[PDB]
Design a protein around this ligand. Structure first.
Ligand SMILES: *[C@@H]1O[C@H](CO)[C@@H](O[C@@H]2O[C@H](CO)[C@@H](O[C@@H]3O[C@H](CO)[C@@H](O)[C@H](O)[C@@H]3O)[C@H](O)[C@H]2NC(C)=O)[C@H](O)[C@H]1NC(C)=O
Ligand SMILES: *[C@@H]1O[C@H](CO)[C@@H](O)[C@H](O)[C@H]1NC(C)=O
Ligand SMILES: *[C@@H]1O[C@H](CO)[C@@H](O)[C@H](O)[C@H]1NC(C)=O
Ligand SMILES: *[C@@H]1O[C@H](CO)[C@@H](O)[C@H](O)[C@H]1NC(C)=O
Ligand SMILES: *[C@H]1O[C@H](CO)[C@H](O)[C@H](O)[C@H]1NC(C)=O
Ligand SMILES: *[C@H]1O[C@H](CO)[C@H](O)[C@H](O)[C@H]1NC(C)=O
Ligand SMILES: *[C@H]1O[C@H](CO)[C@H](O)[C@H](O)[C@H]1NC(C)=O
Ligand SMILES: *[C@H]1O[C@H](CO)[C@H](O)[C@H](O)[C@H]1NC(C)=O
Ligand SMILES: [Ca+2]
Ligand SMILES: [Ca+2]
Ligand SMILES: [Ca+2]
Ligand SMILES: [Ca+2]
Ligand SMILES: [Ca+2]
Ligand SMILES: [Ca+2]
Ligand SMILES: [Ca+2]
Lengths: 522, 141
């Protein structure tokens, strides 16, 4: 009936071959099917697949806590980091190069002499510690400091053990391996490594430019702001609202809430034409599926998320359930997810939502301490999402599965009212409604964002015009419209039995039982 | 951190010194905030410091949910709609005594249904057999 182990024990079939050792002989664990998880599942360290909703809910389902890793917004450090010191007050970490240098380099300013404590900076008992690498001055006296790949052991300050520097935030901008030199950076194809840390775009691509809304018109400039060119000027008291592009066809799209229309143009400002002017009334934001030739649109008069082709003909609504106040949208067609934000639903909950590129399998990617989430951008090479918040005033990042939440900026002085955001290589460009300027920000950690272009009006959605921002991938719907009768909307690579697409029908039709042929709605 | 002036003049020279005005409440490391947002049922600070630890209050024109989760307007008390999460509003509402009608209602002798007193003897038979326009009704000169 059931499965009997080699050691003489009965185990249920469901729990036979499920990464559970069961009998000490591990009879049920010698065979390995354990196929790769689908789009709707999270993959634990040990290969077990669990549903996406189980991630960061409070239960260690993975048995390795892989699905409960850093769900909090980096409230405090974990034993700080090697060659760094911990400020007791707020968990900020600074290195010895700043500790006792004479300047208060963390909010509490405990790293210097204080009249209320009597702590003085200098040498001390470190002569007795005899640290593995070196001693240095701290307000408690001499203390241990150790090189890269050297962290102090369990309650043993004198002893340094080898550490994995690959886990530290921002050690390498794209990729890192720890098998040589205690760590080593590397870059995705198309990028070229500069120095030993930073990967920059190869000069084999034409150029890189940033496109943003001045609040009235559509601007464009270089990555340093030496020269700015007005791309397309708004007519009839218009307003450029949300912008996105398509590098293959050299077209730039932008929405207009005041004119209640959506436009598109060449990068040269030629052939400006109206894409949609029906039922589109307040298009907050926009996105383009660059490999399927689609334009995903956000609407807020009737809260919904649409998809229409680049020329604006085939239309179908994807998300309508409990959509509340949709503001942000981003997508990764290569893998096949759709990310969108929501600063208040029909249920009171604000959230940052994840979905398939056809609206299936919606998930709360980020739910706690989310306030007023705004536009979203993706790190296409490191598989992370970046979203900004206007209520709690921060810029945060989580992976595609919502794990490992890290804050890159925070405070009313830093990012008082962000709206839009975009990544290129190492910088997040984010619009801010309070300082009234498009600001350039480092994507790991920032003490202070630089001003990139200071406007007289509230700026809006920003994007970075570059080829590497739109990596190549095959088109599942390329094989004769994917066999669909009317519309082929791309989905997850693992959806539809690996076909990677789901058929849809334009308004006025519904899918038959074949899910391929459209029939007139009754 | 709100651009009220529409030109950013009310947000210029804002600094992290944590020295807000006496009127404005201070979130610990987030921003200053107006009193009208302290204890208002909404977490306006990052950590909810402005909402935690406070208690609800009500005028004579409002009603308390049993669990203290809201102060609803008195108009919504005894309306047929559950407003409070714990249904504290529609509990204990006046019940029409078995098979009779309230003091404000005439009862149709033909079927037992109730109509307001204002419809008794008004010239229009509202009840299904014209019970409400009985011969005892005073004639209108
Ligand atoms: C995605 O794939 C497309 C198509 O393979 C890439 O576009 C093409 O990239 C090649 C370079 O590998 C370009 O060739 C170069 O063109 C310039 C201009 O004519 C010429 O001076 C060079 O000598 C070289 O021949 C090509 O023009 C370009 N365009 C097309 C439509 O073929 C694209 O770069 C890929 N993008 C990524 C991010 O992988
Ligand atoms: C200190 O570290 C040693 C390392 O072997 C460990 O056995 C011990 O439990 C630790 N004690 C405390 C209190 O952390
Ligand atoms: C919408 O655009 C089409 C194509 O340019 C045009 O024929 C039509 O009149 C427009 N309608 C409105 C209301 O602008
Ligand atoms: C509010 O609370 C006080 C008690 O602290 C009470 O005396 C007062 O009548 C209440 N006022 C309002 C407007 O509800
Ligand atoms: C893993 O299985 C998934 C479905 O659960 C996909 O088929 C995926 O392509 C598989 N991965 C590999 C490497 O075959
Ligand atoms: C902060 O600056 C304000 C400006 O009005 C007041 O001068 C205040 O006394 C200062 N200090 C503190 C602790 O708030
Ligand atoms: C409703 O409850 C009240 C309690 O005071 C009265 O008893 C009234 O007569 C009840 N009517 C019914 C039908 O339950
Ligand atoms: C009719 O006349 C009587 C007196 O006979 C009363 O005055 C009565 O008020 C009159 N009707 C109306 C509608 O006023
Ligand atoms: Ca098992
Ligand atoms: Ca879990
Ligand atoms: Ca210092
Ligand atoms: Ca704000
Ligand atoms: Ca509040
Ligand atoms: Ca009620
Ligand atoms: Ca009557």
């Amino acid at each position: 009936k059931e499965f009997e182990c080699g050691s003489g024990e009965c185990i249920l079939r469901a729990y036979v071959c499920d990464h559970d050792n069961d009998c000490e002989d591990n009879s049920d664990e010698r065979n390995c099917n354990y196929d790769t998880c689908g789009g709707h599942q999270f993959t634990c360290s040990n290969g077990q697949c669990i549903n996406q909703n189980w991630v960061c809910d409070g239960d260690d389902d993975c048995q390795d806590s892989g699905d409960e890793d850093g769900c909090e917004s980096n409230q405090s450090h974990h034993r700080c980091y090697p060659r760094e010191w911990a400020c007791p007050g707020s968990g900020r970490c600074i290195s010895i190069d700043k500790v006792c240098d004479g300047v208060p380099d963390c909010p509490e300013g405990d790293d210097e002499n204080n009249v209320t404590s009597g702590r003085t900076c200098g040498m001390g008992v470190c002569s007795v510690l005899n640290c593995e690498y070196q001693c240095h001055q701290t307000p408690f006296g001499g203390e241990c400091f150790c090189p890269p790949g050297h962290i102090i052991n369990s309650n043993d300050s004198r002893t340094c053990i080898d550490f994995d520097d690959c886990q530290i935030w921002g050690i390498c901008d794209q990729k890192c391996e720890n098998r040589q030199g205690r760590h080593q950076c590397l870059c995705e194809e198309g990028y070229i490594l500069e120095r030993g840390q930073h990967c920059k775009s190869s000069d084999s691509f034409s150029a890189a430019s940033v496109i943003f809304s001045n609040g009235r018109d559509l601007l464009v400039g270089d990555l340093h702001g030496r020269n700015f060119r007005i791309l397309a000027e708004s007519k009839n008291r218009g307003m450029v609202m949300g912008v996105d592009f398509h590098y293959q066809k050299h077209r730039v799209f932008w929405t207009d809430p005041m004119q209640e229309k959506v436009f598109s143009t060449d990068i040269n400002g030629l052939n400006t034409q109206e894409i949609l002017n029906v039922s589109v009334d307040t298009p907050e934001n926009l996105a383009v599926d660059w490999i399927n030739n689609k334009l995903y649109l956000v609407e807020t008069k009737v809260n919904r998320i649409d998809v229409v082709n680049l020329e604006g003909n085939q239309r179908v609504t994807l998300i309508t359930e409990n959509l509340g106040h949709p503001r942000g949208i981003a997508l990764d067609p290569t893998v096949g997810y759709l990310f969108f934000s929501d600063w208040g639903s029909l249920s009171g909950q604000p959230k940052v939502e994840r979905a398939f590129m056809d609206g299936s399998n919606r998930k709360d990617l980020v739910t706690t301490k989310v306030g007023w989430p705004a536009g979203i951008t993706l790190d296409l090479v490191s598989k992370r999402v970046y979203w900004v918040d206007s209520r709690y005033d921060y810029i945060e990042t989580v992976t595609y599965d919502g794990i490992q939440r890290k804050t890159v900026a925070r405070g009313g002085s830093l990012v008082p009212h962000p709206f839009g955001i975009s990544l290129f290589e190492e910088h997040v460009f984010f619009t801010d409604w309070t300082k009234m300027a498009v600001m350039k920000a480092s994507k790991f950690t920032e003490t202070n964002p630089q001003v990139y272009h200071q406007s007289s009006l509230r700026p809006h959605g920003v994007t970075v015009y570059h080829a590497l921002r739109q990596p190549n991938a095959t088109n599942p719907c390329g094989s004769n419209n994917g066999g669909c009768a009317q519309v082929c909307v791309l989905s997850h690579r693992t959806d539809n039995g690996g076909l990677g697409y789901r058929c849809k029908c334009e308004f006025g039709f519904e899918l038959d039982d074949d899910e391929h042929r459209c029939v007139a709605v009754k | 951190t709100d651009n009220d002036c529409s030109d950013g003049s009310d947000e210029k020279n804002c600094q992290a010194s944590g020295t807000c005005q006496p009127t404005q409440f201070r979130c610990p490391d987030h921003r200053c905030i107006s009193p009208l947002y302290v204890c208002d049922g909404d977490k306006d600070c990052a950590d909810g410091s402005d909402e935690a630890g406070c208690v609800l209050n009500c005028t004579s024109a409002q009603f308390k949910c049993a669990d203290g989760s809201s102060c609803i307007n008195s108009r919504y008390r005894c309306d047929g709609v559950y407003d409070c999460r714990d249904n504290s509003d529609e509990a204990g509402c006046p019940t029409r005594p078995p098979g009779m009608c309230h003091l404000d209602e005439f009862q149709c002798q033909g079927d037992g249904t109730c109509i307001p007193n204002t419809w008794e003897c008004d010239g229009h038979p509202d009840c299904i057999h014209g019970s409400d326009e009985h011969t005892g009704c005073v004639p209108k000169t």
